Design a protein around this nucleic acid. Sequence first.
RNA 1: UUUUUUU
Length: 698
Amino acid sequence: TTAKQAEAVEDSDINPWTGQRHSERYFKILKARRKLPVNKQRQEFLDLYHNNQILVFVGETGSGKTTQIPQYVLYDELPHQTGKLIACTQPRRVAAMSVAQRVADELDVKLGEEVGYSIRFENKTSSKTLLKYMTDGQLLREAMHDRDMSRYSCIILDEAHERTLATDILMALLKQLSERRKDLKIIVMSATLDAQKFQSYFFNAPLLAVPGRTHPVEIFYTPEAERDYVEAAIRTVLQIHACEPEGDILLFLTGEEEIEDACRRISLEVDEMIRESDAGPMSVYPLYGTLPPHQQQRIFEKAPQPFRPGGRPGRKCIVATNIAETSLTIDGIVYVVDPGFSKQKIYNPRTRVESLLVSPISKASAQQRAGRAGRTRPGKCFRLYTEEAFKKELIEQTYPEILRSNLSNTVLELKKLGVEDLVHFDLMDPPAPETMMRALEELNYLACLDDDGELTPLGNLASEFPLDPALAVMLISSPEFYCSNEILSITSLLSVPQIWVRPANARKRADEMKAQFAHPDGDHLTLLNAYHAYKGAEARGEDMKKWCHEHFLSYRHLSSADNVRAQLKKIMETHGIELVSTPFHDKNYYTNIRRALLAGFFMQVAMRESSNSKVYKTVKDEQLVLIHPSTTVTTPYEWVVYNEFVLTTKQYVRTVTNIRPEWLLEIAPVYYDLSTFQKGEIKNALTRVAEKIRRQQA
RNA sequence: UUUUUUU
Ligand SMILES: Nc1ncnc2c1ncn2[C@@H]1O[C@H](COP(=O)(O)OP(=O)(O)O)[C@@H](O)[C@H]1O
Ligand SMILES: C[As](C)(=O)[O-]
Ligand code: BEF
Ligand SMILES: [Mg+2]
């Protein structure tokens, strides 16, 4: 129960957790572990952990927080052996997997037994699991079926500074839960926190600060600002490989296509360096969220050897988003290149629209990016901006996601978690009252909430799916339209990135191949055609990787959609949601699917402004939009339903489907009662249709 | 005319 007693157990020739002998690797790792900064203050942690329920833990990047603290807790529970687990949340999936593997080696156990991890589509845990690393979202999902979270004796919220939606909800639940359960220890960790703020939020909780740093990270700034950060990044990477001593490179960029372009350009230049300038080999790895876990994990591959002894060193270059910004320890990395940008989510309360925008990062993020080096060996960080641009122009801390998001989903889960009063629900940063009210009214229109704001059985059922309420309600109500199987597939396809591939090289052949899946009356149906063909060739036994290539479809996203569909189907079967289909050659086969979409998306409908106008007008809001250029429908109806809203240098609605206005009055009579509609051509048009429908009464 | 993340 004290530090020196626990250390004696760690030195034992036999492993307490397996009943088998400790390997020789274990003892060398253990020797290196005890040189970490957090190890110096282990006792100071222990007596604070004992005397307090909630604790804030701060230490530099490299300190030992994520890997050592849960082990400290585990060894503290050692003398009496509980069934309850120790939880450690990570904001990223790659983080949860990588750290769990590391700790598994540190405890000399195999991954998935004593030390495991849990993320979406992968629950690598067992009945022997004592320590579980997971994503904050995964834990939040677990809490929606276990409010008290009885499975856990200790929950460690890591990298809390990121302030994701899950993190904020979790902090609020855990704070209120800590009054209910005194047998629940809670620890909040980060290298870049606002300590006093977090302390004050958790009932003036104690703070433990570890001062030390394992290895130094030298930080360099540009003398003047550069306008093309992608060009400056590529230039920096190539300069390092050409002149600097050995050491792998971590480069941060903003998005997938930017990264894929960068990797191509880096590889091209390196290849010419290698052939004509005696440069060493360089492997380039892309890293972003939509990559499968197997390809993400390839960043831990060893850098290539030099071509010849005494030759220029071979090295590795990881080109990543900010999923590699925190938590990860990539051994071999010496150089970090920080252009200072990330794609961030912004929200407009007025226009109901959320969008992505490439923006400057915060000082905390910048510090974190640099912290990916200086972990195993001294590091260098090349910040592609000015030192005074760092101190004056960069925000101290990125704004919380809950202040930058649509809260329709967030609110629905809060009700499911059993939050009695939304107004007095103590969130660390409370969102704007209008954002909150508008979420309540959307959930009200979807019949997920009462008029008094209490959960509907429908709403309770909607919170079971990894989907936004509108998408969930569409899926749940689909059997009423006799096409639940098809909506299930469409729902899955809407939950993944665009399956369509259109390289600059052959855009016109890509559109040629897309044209054979094209359905005149909507993009949703076009997706369904592409999916059926995909599954058709799959069952036929053809290899899909090539099949997707000749058809210009993303095998990556199509495969990802199948994972979603399998998960969603299992949920539907669990809660007795009927799975049915209409025979393909039936006349109403397509119309049923189109009408089914409206069951959840009746609030995302736009009318054509005039006779020969390409401008559409959203209902109620009356926003002026254009149909996204990547649309299948050649000649669109005066009434369409759209799935998403996008903002390029023009305002677009995306993935639209031609509908008939009489469907709107049929499926959503409350939202489309015309007393609510006010002084509009949309109300005029809708009024005429209602009268026509009444006439058809005869 | 790309999905930054996460369920
Ligand atoms: N996968 C790994 N390979 C080699 N060393 C590692 C690995 N993970 C962690 N370490 C060592 O343990 C230290 C602590 O890592 P970690 O607990 O993740 O730090 P923190 O959570 O404070 O950032 C690292 O700085 C590094 O020295
Ligand atoms: C806008 As900047 C990250 O170059 O200071
Ligand atoms: F602060 Be550690 F790098 F997660
Ligand atoms: Mg960490």
